[PDB]
Amino acid sequence: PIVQNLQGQMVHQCISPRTLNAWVKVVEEKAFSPEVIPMFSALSCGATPQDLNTMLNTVGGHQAAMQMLKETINEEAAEWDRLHPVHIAPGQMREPRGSDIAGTTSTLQEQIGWMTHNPPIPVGEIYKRWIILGLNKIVRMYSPTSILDIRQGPKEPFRDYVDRFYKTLRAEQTLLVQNANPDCKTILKALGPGATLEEMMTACQ
Amino acid sequence: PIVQNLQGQMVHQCISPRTLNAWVKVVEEKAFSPEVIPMFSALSCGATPQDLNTMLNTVGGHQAAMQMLKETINEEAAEWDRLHPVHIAPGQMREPRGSDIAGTTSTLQEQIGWMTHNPPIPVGEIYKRWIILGLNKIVRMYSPTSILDIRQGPKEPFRDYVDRFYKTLRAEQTLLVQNANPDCKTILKALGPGATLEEMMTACQ
Amino acid sequence: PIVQNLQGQMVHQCISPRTLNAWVKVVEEKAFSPEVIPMFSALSCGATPQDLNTMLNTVGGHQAAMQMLKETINEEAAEWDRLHPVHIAPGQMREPRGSDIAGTTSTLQEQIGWMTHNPPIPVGEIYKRWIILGLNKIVRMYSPTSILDIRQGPKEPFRDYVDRFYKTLRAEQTLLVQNANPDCKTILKALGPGATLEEMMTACQ
Amino acid sequence: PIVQNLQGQMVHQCISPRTLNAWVKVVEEKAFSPEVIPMFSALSCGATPQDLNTMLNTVGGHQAAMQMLKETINEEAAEWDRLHPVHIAPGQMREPRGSDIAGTTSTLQEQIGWMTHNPPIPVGEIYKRWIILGLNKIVRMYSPTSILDIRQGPKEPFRDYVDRFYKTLRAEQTLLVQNANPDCKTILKALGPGATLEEMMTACQ
Amino acid sequence: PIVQNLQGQMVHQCISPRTLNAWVKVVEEKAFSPEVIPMFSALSCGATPQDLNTMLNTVGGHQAAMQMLKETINEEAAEWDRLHPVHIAPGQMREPRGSDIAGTTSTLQEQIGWMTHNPPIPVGEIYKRWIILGLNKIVRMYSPTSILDIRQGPKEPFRDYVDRFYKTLRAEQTLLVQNANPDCKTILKALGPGATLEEMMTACQ
Amino acid sequence: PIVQNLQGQMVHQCISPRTLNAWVKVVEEKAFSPEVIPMFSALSCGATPQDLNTMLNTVGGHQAAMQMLKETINEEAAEWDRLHPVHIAPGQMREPRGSDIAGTTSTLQEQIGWMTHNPPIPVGEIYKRWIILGLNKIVRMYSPTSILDIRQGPKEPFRDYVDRFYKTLRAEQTLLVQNANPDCKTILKALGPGATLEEMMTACQ
Ligand SMILES: O=C(O)c1c(C(=O)O)c(C(=O)O)c(C(=O)O)c(C(=O)O)c1C(=O)O
């Protein structure tokens, strides 16, 4: 990543073994559950494109997902090149193409040059956005259940049902009441409109 | 978070893999037991709003709770906007709205600008207060037992009973004596008024 | 905590995830065995009152103990206010009350101001003393056995007996010989007065 | 490795116990699965040739692989010497031979001298390229299955089949449709040409 | 401990949670096996007397040993006071007594003052020597077996026997041949005088 | 060890708990498998003689090996004294004897003085060489099998056989073909001379 040193200059630092292991382990344990995306984003804080490829490339499983991700990245790269055509002046900085942002045709030094320029050409942040776009599609693809099929069991605590409901809604990216069981549905219908989730949860507790 | 470097300037630092993992693990292991709140507060020391959302968003379970939390945050944000209406001067700092404090409509750079201003506009601390307000409501909601139902068993050591009593009181946010078993109740009644907890515990040991 | 930076100024630093976890784990594993107190003291090196409350508040169990601790803290705070009555001059430092030392009515900034003043008003150290006073009372309360009941078994190695003896004495805060078994008692009686523990242990080995 | 200090000079640092352990553990757990190579590359960020040999030499198993790697390294070293023949001026820097790049005939001090020269003679990066060339050959050798033999089972979810397919293709370094089972093959044939992987995966979900 | 900062001044640093845990764990796992002493010495590098007491006091078991250690420390302290009698000049440094070196009657500030004086009065190193003296006595006391009773079994590999022999000798603080089994004894007798351990081990392999 | 600080001076640093634990654990898990030596060398990067003794002395088992190591060290020390006889000028640096290099008769301060002199008298590196010489002898002694006895089983994959072969050769410090099983021997004989290991392994795959 690029970080501020103690003196206050923006310097490149090696990606840490702790960061590398954290990402690999979270993918092993959580696959593409929605909460993996904000973990990815936080673990890649200050990442160069090189770092971002490192993180993606260190994943051993899920190669169907990783191939879908490349497709998304290539679509975003092509759209970048459409909006940002490029024409080298000796010792000067060239303008990044899509594949330079994605780290496949740019060097680490070029990446550092862009990201620490004044003003910065934030190739790490641009690439991270494309990756997250791609990961969101994967999360939704691998979401196993429609919210229409999240219905409260006859003996299921309301809390547990609501957990399943909003878990599913998050992965999928009135119905809460309609899908409740008969006893809690009746209680919730008599709360009237504009009840908060807290009030519903209290009511069916 | 925003931290003091070695030289003494307030700089942004990436949230650490250790911090991220600690929060996720404490929620996995403790759910919304009351002691999770001071852990949250300590793990988010110096946090930007971005960091605070990261921590909340990396939680995979408990989505009923996370949705209740958003409701609380939105109520606190709306009350902020009521008390702090906002009117951009080129190169100048805009005033934060509720949704800027909550990190949903403000950039990391804006957040850093506010938090390191002289005097600081402490958007991380303001947001953390709203979050803790929300978490406290959740702790109380998920508190399983009334203090009225914490009663000492016939063979239950007084210490163990008092542990359950104050554990419950903490989650719920004279009765100690009334809920004691017959033998310890008699001992405690004869200590008279103004006995300390230490003296009660000694007496029934 | 407040620490010396690399340059040599006294700066506030966030309490680390490692420190937080170490304290929580030691309480989980050891409860109020006497050795927990020096661990507490070492883990809270340079602690502000805020840090000290964090450590105490992150403990999930033992709420009978934590309530006894508050009582001790309140007694020490009241005695502080008796010896140190307080009368704000714009931009000047106010004098700390007991509840300010205990971190319940003082801000982090006030705490830093006191602890880094020249000379320092060491509110973290003062509060830590009160807490340790309280923890010592708890260790003694939870000490399960009188030293009078630590007696050497007929087949019990002398070393193991002495371990139990001094373990108990430490928790409780001639008898070694009297409580020894008949065979070792006879050996120890013939060593005469002024035998070291080493010599006794050698003698009964 | 060679790193930037806080002041901004390029200094040698000892390889960390964390880095050493991470590499050894990844080889123990993953052997020569393709994802081990980007992990190697990231763990050896800023590595001297000495560091690179350390990492390779700390591997206890897989000595057939490590011997094949030496062969590749020696071929790359010989090709370096063919393109870069060398002729010592007192106190001056000598030009590196292949075996100097590979760290077998150069000292740590010579390596640091080359890597921190202006412009740098990047012996660590040159050697890392040769090593990765060698590791790629090993990954391919140890790839157990031809892509021709990755065929979807009659009850096998399409996702799981695609995972196996691209996993195999990666190790090996239209067919997706041809190797699908009859039911999904029919669905995929009716999508027509130019279907994305996402669309295929959606179609057979 | 007292350490050199980045600038090069001798500063106090808090004892780390990692150091504290390492010591406690090594005592839990190894008790007073001889190798615990060099681990102690290395873990207490730069330690103040306060740090040294912390390490000793965090040990929960082995209180017979810890009491023997105090006896040794008190003997060394008394001998210090015999050789170094002491007579306070306002703002000046007082001379340390034995109990000041042992950290029982000196403050952390006094300890830092002595250890960072020019020339240093190395109270941490002096105390560490007394502690190690004490620990050595304990290692020897808890050594379970005489070297006279380490004899090679009829089927026991010579290597394993030599391991037991020198393990015992280390704890206890020609015979190798005499205690060997008949077959290896005969081989070793025919090597003649001045055989190295390597040659003996080769001979009986 | 001696390290470069952030400013760029060569300073002494305490050996870290992580380093100490890594060495102890690698010896526990791997004993004197050949790969332990490069791990030792990397873990003792920048080590003083004091640090090197610490690492060796913290090993609890393998005392036959540790005694053989001392013998090797004493032979290397005696040869040092033969080549480097020594004659103290007030405030000046004395010349190191063999036992000073081995850290048994020199102080930490003397060691630092030699290692940071201009030019450095690299006593840590000199001692490390002697230790590694000694460790190599031990690796070879504890090598359990002659390369003559590594022969491919009738059903043994060629890869697994080659792994055992080069593993053994490494510990021991044409035959590959001769020791292959009949079927692979025939294949390898028909490749002709100058086949690479890769080509042999491909051929028998
Ligand atoms: O191994 C490290 O270099 C390290 C250490 C460490 O010195 O033990 C610590 C640490 O002080 O405990 C920390 C840490 O602050 O938690 C880190 C870390 O930043 O994660 C590291 C490390 O860089 O790995």
Tags for this model:
Capsid protein p24 (chains A, B, C, D, E, F); Non-ribosomal Peptide Synthetase Peptidyl Carrier Protein, Chain A; mainly alpha; 205 residues; Human Immunodeficiency Virus Type 1 Capsid Protein; homohexamer; binds benzene hexacarboxylic acid
Q: What fold name goes in the CATH topology slot of the largest domain in chain A? A: Human Immunodeficiency Virus Type 1 Capsid Protein
Strand order of the largest sheet of chain A: 1-2
Oligomer: homohexamer
Query: What percent of the residues of chain A sit in helical stretches (DSSP H or I)?
Result: 55-70%
Number of strands of chain A: 2
How many helical stretches of chain A? Answer: 11
Largest sheet of chain A: 2 strands, antiparallel
PDB class: viral protein
Keywords: Capsid, Viral Protein
Assembly: hexameric
Entry title: Hexameric HIV-1 CA in complex with hexacarboxybenzene
Task: Please provide a brief summary of the model.
Six copies of one chain form a homohexamer. Chain A has 205 residues and is mainly α. Chain A has eleven helices and two strands; from the N terminus they run ββααααααααααα.
Overall description:
Six copies of one chain form a homohexamer. With 205 residues, chain A is mostly helical. Chain A has two domains: 1-146, Human Immunodeficiency Virus Type 1 Capsid Protein, CATH 1.10.375; 147-205, Non-ribosomal Peptide Synthetase Peptidyl Carrier Protein, Chain A (Orthogonal Bundle). Chain A contains eleven helices and two strands; from the N terminus they run ββααααααααααα. Chain A has a two-stranded antiparallel ribbon. Chain A is elongated. The A-B interface holds A 1, 3-4, 6-8, 16, 18-19, 22, 30, 33-35, 38-39, 41-43, 45-46, 159, 162-163, 165-167, 169-170, 196-198, 201-202, 205 and B 5-7, 9, 11-15, 17-18, 20-21, 24, 53-54, 57-64, 66-68, 71, 137, 141-142. The structure holds benzene hexacarboxylic acid.
